[PDB]
């Protein structure tokens, strides 16, 4: 930690990410006297973690070992406790650039959900920016506040428990960017406009279904939004393997040599959602 600044050494209260081999991993809250069990053995925090530098090989128990990684939003996204379906880093990367997020940006978000996007945004807009996020589910809202304090990023984020479609984001004409991940985003387009600065800003909505996109685009146009774009981004991941196809027996007694290939981990890439962007300008 922190999530917003690299530190050399592991300390109490830190969220650490353990790599367990393959690509499997688990997140851990470091506390004195605490123990964590893994397939490679046990980790006693007070002696095996605390005081030690990130990126180190940590021997666990019966000679087993693990690597400990410094937390990042990307790693957090892959290890956080789901209270909702979340966005993954591929969609988040595109959202972040297309919303023109940077240090100092003021951002409004709903719904907070499980905080995957929230942490990414905070990482990007720190140290001078602020995130005003909204979640109308009391428990999810509070669980998010807890995590933000645990991760020491409360300064850069305010969670408001309310319905974004009736009561808005809780701020007006302060935001450079608005991000929506809710079932009925067309009912929030007006508040997004109100939340964005008068001088203008950027808008993005995430929707799984094309009918949600259609309604969103209709509402954006009617309210005065411009530069409407709807995109979908699809990740493909490859395994690096050496393969050798056996030569055929034609009866004969070079052109059949082994090769490196990049094969997809999965035969199919799924659909998360459509991303609809737009711009607010005066006039």
């Amino acid at each position: 930690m922190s999530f917003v600044a690299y530190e050399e050494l592991i300390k109490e209260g830190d969220t650490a990410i353990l790599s367990l081999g393959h690509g499997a991993m688990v997140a851990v809250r470091v506390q004195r006297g605490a123990q964590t069990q893994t397939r490679h053995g046990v980790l006693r925090h007070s002696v095996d973690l605390i005081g030690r530098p990130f990126g180190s090989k940590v021997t666990c128990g019966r000679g087993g070992w693990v690597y400990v990684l410094h937390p990042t939003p990307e790693l957090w996204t892959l290890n956080l406790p789901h209270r909702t379906q979340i966005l993954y880093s591929t969609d988040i990367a595109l959202i972040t650039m297309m919303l023109e997020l940077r240090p100092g940006s003021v951002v409004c978000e709903s719904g907070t959900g499980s905080g995957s996007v929230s942490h990414a945004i905070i990482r990007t807009i720190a140290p001078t920016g602020h995130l005003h996020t909204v979640e109308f589910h009391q428990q999810r809202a509070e669980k998010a506040r807890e995590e933000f304090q645990e991760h020491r990023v409360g300064r850069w984020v305010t969670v408001r428990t309310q319905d974004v479609c009736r009561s808005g984001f809780g701020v007006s004409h302060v935001a450079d960017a608005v991000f929506l991940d809710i079932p009925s985003p067309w009912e929030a387009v007006g508040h997004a406009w109100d939340a964005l600065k008068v001088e203008g800003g950027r808008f993005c909505s995430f929707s799984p279904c094309i009918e949600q996109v259609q309604r969103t685009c209709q509402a954006l146009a009617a309210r005065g939004f411009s530069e409407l774009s709807t995109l979908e981004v699809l990740p493909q991941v490859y395994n690096v393997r050496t393969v050798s196809l056996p030569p055929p027996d034609l009866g004969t007694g070079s052109d059949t040599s082994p090769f490196r290939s990049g094969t997809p981990m999965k035969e199919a890439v799924g659909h998360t959602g459509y991303l609809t962007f737009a711009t607010k300008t005066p006039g």
């Binding site: 799984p208 196809l245 052109d255 199919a268």
Partner: protein
Amino acid sequence: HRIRDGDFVVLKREDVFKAVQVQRRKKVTFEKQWFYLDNVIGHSYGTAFEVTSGGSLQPKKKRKEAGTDNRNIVDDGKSQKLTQDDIKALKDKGIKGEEIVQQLIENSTTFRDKTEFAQDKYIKKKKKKYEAIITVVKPSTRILSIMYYAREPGKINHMRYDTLAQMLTLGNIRAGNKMIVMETCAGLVLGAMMERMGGFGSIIQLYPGGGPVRAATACFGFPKSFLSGLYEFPLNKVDSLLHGTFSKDYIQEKQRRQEEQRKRHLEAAALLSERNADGLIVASRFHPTPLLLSLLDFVAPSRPFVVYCQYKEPLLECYTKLRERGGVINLRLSETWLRNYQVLPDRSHPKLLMSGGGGYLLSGFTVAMDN
């Protein structure tokens, strides 16, 4: 036409397929169940079914307040007011299933507070588990190619069904052709070619090992008439051919097959020697490059050939090598991506994008050599 005993058949539940031959008093499994197929007869293909007591019964072909948000929906874990033990009783009691659903709904405190869509989704999830409906359909390349890619993709070198379709088209497979095929895809490609040739023309199958695999081919339920034009010839005697240097009671039955097989192989070698084939289809676990460079010699000019490979790199070499050899034109290295869609009112979107594991194709036309 209609279903009958001895008929090769395909069973379908949701998107899951399994092929079987119908037999009186025979036990087969399908997605965690046991059937007796006897009862499914005289019924038209497309008919539906349900299990009961080990036997299938013909069922019909066919058969409101809600919330707006989940803002106050909590995961207590105490929403379903019946137990994991109570639940077995209903099945152990052998009740329909639709009622088990209705019961689960009625005993869900949250159901009424859920959105209409969330409700529809809750039901669909339950029906899928308790309302097991089996359809019986007719074998076809469509169904068998989709079945294999889902059930045994390794047996067909991960050739996706859209890729198979391209091969049939790019190779202009049609009635009357003299086709050459070299397949280790369980006979699926062979069968697909046979469907599109309709018993007209001839197919010469080059096989490795001791014989050609035709497990899939058998699922098609082809007439005997389609066999007259079907030939086979061992792949290990190909080099000889392109050089012309090619030659207590069952022991007799073994002598019959071995000589009747010898015969059929000599015919096949004659047909190949004519070097006038109308196309070449290759889809195997073997490296394609040497197969092509050899087998094309059997193909006539102005004829299409198509080579499948699960991997791209081998087809890059084959492309370059064909370019040295000459005798080909309009070389095309291709791949197809396939996307399927959920189309429902207010709930429309893509599901899966199949790519990279459907395979690659190298295609072109033969031409005359320079001399």
